[PDB]
Amino acid sequence: IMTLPKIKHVRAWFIGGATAEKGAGGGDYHDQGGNHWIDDHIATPMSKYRDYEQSRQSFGINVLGTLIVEVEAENRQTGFAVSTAGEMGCFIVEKHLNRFIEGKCVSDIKLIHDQMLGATMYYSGSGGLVMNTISCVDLALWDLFGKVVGLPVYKLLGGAVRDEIQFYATGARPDLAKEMGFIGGKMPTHWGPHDGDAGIRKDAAMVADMREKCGPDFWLMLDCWMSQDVNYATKLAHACAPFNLKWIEECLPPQQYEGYRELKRNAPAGMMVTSGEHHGTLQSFRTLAETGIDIMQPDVGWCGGLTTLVEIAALAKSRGQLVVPHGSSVYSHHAVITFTNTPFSEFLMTSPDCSTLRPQFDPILLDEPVPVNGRIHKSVLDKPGFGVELNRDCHLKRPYSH
Amino acid sequence: IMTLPKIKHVRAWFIGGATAEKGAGGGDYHDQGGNHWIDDHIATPMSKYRDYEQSRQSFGINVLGTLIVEVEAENRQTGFAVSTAGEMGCFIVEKHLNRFIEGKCVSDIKLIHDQMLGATMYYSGSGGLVMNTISCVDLALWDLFGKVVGLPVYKLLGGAVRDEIQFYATGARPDLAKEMGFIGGKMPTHWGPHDGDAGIRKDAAMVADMREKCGPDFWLMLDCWMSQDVNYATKLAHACAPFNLKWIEECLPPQQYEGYRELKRNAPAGMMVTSGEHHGTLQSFRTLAETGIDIMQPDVGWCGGLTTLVEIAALAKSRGQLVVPHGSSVYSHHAVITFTNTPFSEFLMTSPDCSTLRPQFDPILLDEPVPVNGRIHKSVLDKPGFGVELNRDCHLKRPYSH
Ligand SMILES: O=C(O)[C@H](O)C[C@@H](O)CCCO
Ligand SMILES: C[C@H](O)[C@H](O)C[C@@H](O)C(=O)O
Ligand SMILES: [Mg+2]
Ligand SMILES: [Mg+2]
């Protein structure tokens, strides 16, 4: 029998965010610099305001920054993970959650997870900031466990059900993505309800243009980042039907379950409606799944962690729905390669102009895998835990201790 | 016409919490000391764990502490409010929300509220910590506006619809509350699902005992603080029917809307099922209301603020449902005294043994009204804003600035 060490320490750091260096990248996808496609007039719940229409950074989409959680075993072996939470995330880990982590066996992952959810239920809001923090701890624990055992997380889960992961790319250049080998391209909408018919015409024209440039089989999708209402989303969906838009994503704020049910009913035949990247907790996904949307897209570092993601996958599978996680790099790779119902995955372009394969969490992860010709072979993931190391060269800050 | 000043500064402080003095009380109801009824073997989602069964403080119900938000107008007049968020709440106000507040007219309350919701949607989780912070800002704004205009918030809202507010008391001593003049007493359950039939027997016996001591007309209620499941809650509800328990509260975690619908259907005839203190955003309450529960109980400082509470009241009223806010002291008083569908209100005993009328938010609020003979006359609320001043004698800490 294999002997397992206990967890000795848990520590949290952060980079980027309102109290560090702006544009640090890493865990917080939106903590970028200037002239980045990911901040180029993207439609949001705030773009109806003139002062917040051109830039998401202007309303503060980058204030949190990156949270880094590292768990150390008694034998000095360590595991870690990153997510979006920054300094406040550090407070939660160092001043609250540490009590459930330290002293546990490295294999007590599900126990620690349940205790974190139970202990923070009174202030977690079942999603967002607090759940991002819990997710980061969960991932760090899986990483440590796999590194202690000497196995990649995907093998601990029951092995891969496919030899490689195929990706679609999210960014402003589906055409460049096709050249890179991706199977599809998801573009962000730039106009919203306040833009009316003109907004619909413009975003639909954007899709029409890429359809002409990419061909019929390369998938095209629209990401709406919680910026619409049912009527606008319905009009946009129908305006894009002629171009065989594969799916229209997150048209509504997360609490609007009833609206998603209506939107899905109104959707053009064969066109999928998706959401989920901002939802958290298994129970929320149960409610989301029952709205009838085609694909739920939890972010492994935001939905509650790998422990929760695996449950969401089972939920979707029981209903014949697909689960295609939001970004997440290796944290998603090790999970989805084992999911029969995750036939493809997402790669969110961190490259300012979507012309290069800059790593998903650049530069916080050392040796971070990137799709080559739109794919990541399972052999690439054949390393202990999630297979990466923390880039200690980054200016990590430790705001709290215990 | 009256001239209104612009908002010049917004500042956040905190007391209590994991990074200050434990047991500070104030905004965080649970940041108490030892031997307090509010921490006496209260059933929770964590009490199934032996190490966290006896005390909620042990699992960290007190790590956040009190958040204090003060908004200052150009004319030097100030308004403020308190809630549960502490240090992290300060980060959110000083490093993110300040951009939507400063520079606005003191009357731009609803605008600032919508911008706070839109700008934090990507990490707010629609409730909990972030929403508590937003609520605190909202309340501070109403306070400032009323103080600038020279009117109590309840008059700005459209006046009182009753001359006094009648209260029920939450605590371990319904009998002592009856002597104090309260119209009812809500007790916390001490056992949970893991305790099975014995747990049900014990909490039901507790209700039976108070029914014998208090008489038939004094109301009795059970608060279950998200600690049960549908079957346990159903059994407990039926076990308490013989004693005419008025309602059984928050039996399930907030995301379990489907469970609440089932619980309400299973409830004994005439017995009410309530929840809502941990829910946030108007949309969540729409979903909650549709489960059919009888009373929604948002906390003004957690649900999104006064701006949101007024909307929730309209939602409930449109359906014939009642809205009875969770604690909140003056922040609830000024709102509910104007609600036709809030016939009574709650006073959560901060007194360690529920024998005295220690102020709801003691000691952070100066001149904080307390029910006298179970009531608060509207004349008591006849002061600008929410009618109270910040107890600057407390050891307020300013972790962030901008
Ligand atoms: O699904 C995703 O990769 C994210 O939602 C992309 C998002 O950050 C860009 C805004 C699109 O409207
Ligand atoms: C005593 C209970 O656990 C809560 O702290 C009280 C709260 O839920 C209320 O409704 O007052
Ligand atoms: Mg998306
Ligand atoms: Mg309650």
Side-chain angles (χ1 to χ4, degrees), chain A residues 277-315:
Chain A
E277 72 191 61
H278 288 106
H279 288 82
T281 77
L282 182 65
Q283 294 66 36
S284 289
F285 280 90
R286 173 277 186 85
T287 303
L288 186 56
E290 289 182 15
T291 64
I293 62 169
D294 306 274
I295 307 179
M296 294 183 288
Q297 308 165 298
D299 179 295
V300 196
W302 305 347
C303 76
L306 172 61
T307 297
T308 304
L309 175 62
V310 174
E311 301 177 323
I312 296 171
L315 169 47

Side-chain angles (χ1 to χ4, degrees), chain A residues 48-49 52 58-61 87-88 96 99-100 114 118 122-123 125-129 255 258 278 281 287 400, chain B residues 48-49 52 58-61 87-88 96 99-100 114 122-123 125-129 255 258 278 281 287 400:
Chain A
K48 61 185 177 181
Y49 291 115
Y52 305 109
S58 70
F59 72 70
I61 193 173
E87 194 169 319
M88 294 187 286
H96 187 187
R99 78 186 66 187
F100 309 113
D114 186 68
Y122 76 93
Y123 74 89
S126 302
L129 178 62
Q255 321 99 86
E258 300 86 354
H278 288 106
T281 77
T287 303
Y400 306 100
Chain B
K48 61 186 177 180
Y49 290 115
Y52 305 109
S58 73
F59 72 70
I61 193 173
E87 194 170 319
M88 295 188 283
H96 187 187
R99 77 187 67 186
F100 309 112
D114 186 68
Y122 76 93
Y123 74 90
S126 302
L129 178 62
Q255 321 99 87
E258 300 85 355
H278 288 106
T281 77
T287 302
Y400 307 100

Side-chain angles (χ1 to χ4, degrees), chain B residues 157-320:
Chain B
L157 295 178
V161 295
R162 58 182 62 79
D163 295 330
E164 58 175 35
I165 299 172
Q166 56 176 178
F167 293 84
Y168 71 84
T170 299
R173 298 300 297 283
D175 55 337
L176 297 184
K178 181 174 183 292
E179 313 187 330
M180 287 178 245
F182 288 102
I183 68 181
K186 179 171 72 186
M187 305 165 272
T189 50
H190 294 279
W191 310 95
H194 50 288
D195 293 302
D197 299 297
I200 291 173
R201 173 189 310 123
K202 288 183 286 187
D203 280 319
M206 172 183 72
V207 174
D209 174 63
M210 284 298 151
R211 172 58 72 213
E212 191 290 306
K213 297 176 183 171
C214 299
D217 298 334
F218 182 75
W219 307 337
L220 290 182
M221 308 78 125
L222 275 180
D223 188 293
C224 309
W225 214 73
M226 319 176 286
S227 72
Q228 318 176 333
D229 51 55
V230 175
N231 177 68
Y232 189 79
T234 297
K235 291 171 68 178
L236 181 59
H238 282 270
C240 292
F243 317 115
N244 185 37
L245 188 75
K246 193 174 181 63
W247 79 66
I248 185 168
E249 174 175 333
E250 194 175 35
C251 299
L252 318 170
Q255 321 99 87
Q256 292 177 38
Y257 300 111
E258 300 85 355
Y260 273 110
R261 171 172 295 100
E262 183 183 6
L263 177 57
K264 168 59 179 174
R265 291 181 179 126
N266 288 177
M271 189 179 156
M272 297 190 290
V273 177
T274 76
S275 184
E277 71 191 63
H278 288 106
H279 287 81
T281 77
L282 184 62
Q283 293 66 35
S284 287
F285 281 90
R286 173 276 186 84
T287 302
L288 186 56
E290 289 181 14
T291 64
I293 61 168
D294 306 272
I295 307 180
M296 293 183 291
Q297 307 166 299
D299 179 294
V300 196
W302 306 347
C303 77
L306 173 61
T307 297
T308 304
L309 175 62
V310 174
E311 301 176 322
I312 296 172
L315 169 46
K317 184 174 179 188
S318 73
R319 298 170 57 85

